[PDB]
Design a protein around this ligand. Structure first.
Ligand code: NA
Lengths: 114, 99
């Protein structure tokens, strides 16, 4: 398959707005560009490394949520019922335990969060 | 406090499973629930069900329960297009967990 984070990198307003009208999500978001998505992903992993380490050694959970907080826009979001495009500064990455990877996990997806 | 500190089990379902990509990862909302059931332990889903019960027992105004599910717990699936109320969708999730 593909890397689902790519559904949330550099998307147009048109694309995101289509997901919240025809699609069935309450909101849809996208990182500004690849450099930003990569930078946010790395910072979120590094600032949650203790949480990831506990998750890998002790947890039977299928996935782990790791959140990123900042005060600088890293992307855009739209919500059902409106065409307003919001700049957003926070993000969420979802990982899954994957013993075959060097870190022990794979990134399932990630995107900005209002 | 922050809501996911006290409702972590529902936050986990709603943020990790009902992520923006749920249709591509798992399929429709019930196929998503089935993937959760198959993947996670019995203890995990029983603690998630307990959180549903804490919500249902309050008989909240629907607008408040919807704000909790969609905005505070941050579910990406817009269940109101399939469900008349947030109570009814939660009762459905609960039932989907059974045998
Ligand atoms: Na922020």
């Amino acid at each position: 398959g593909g890397h689902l984070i790519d559904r949330h990198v550099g998307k147009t307003e048109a694309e995101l707005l289509n997901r919240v009208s025809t699609g069935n999500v309450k909101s849809a978001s996208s990182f500004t560009d690849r450099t930003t998505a990569e930078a946010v992903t790395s910072k979120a992993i590094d600032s949650n490394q203790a949480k990831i380490d506990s998750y890998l050694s002790g947890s039977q959970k299928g996935y782990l949520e790791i959140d990123y907080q900042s005060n600088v826009p890293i992307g855009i979001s739209v919500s059902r019922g409106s065409t307003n495009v919001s700049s957003v500064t926070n993000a969420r990455i979802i990982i899954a335990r994957d013993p075959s990877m060097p870190t022990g996990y794979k990134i399932i997806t990630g995107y900005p969060t209002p | 406090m922050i809501i996911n500190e006290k409702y972590p089990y529902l936050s986990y379902l709603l943020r990790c499973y009902f992520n923006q990509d749920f249709e591509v990862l798992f399929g429709n909302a019930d196929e998503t629930l089935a993937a959760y059931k198959a993947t996670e332990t019995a203890e995990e889903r029983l603690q998630m069900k307990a959180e549903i019960d804490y919500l249902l027992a309050l008989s909240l105004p629907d607008d408040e329960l919807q704000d909790i599910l969609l905005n505070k717990l941050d579910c990406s699936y817009y269940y109101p297009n399939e469900w008349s109320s947030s109570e009814e969708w939660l009762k459905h999730i609960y039932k989907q967990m059974n045998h």
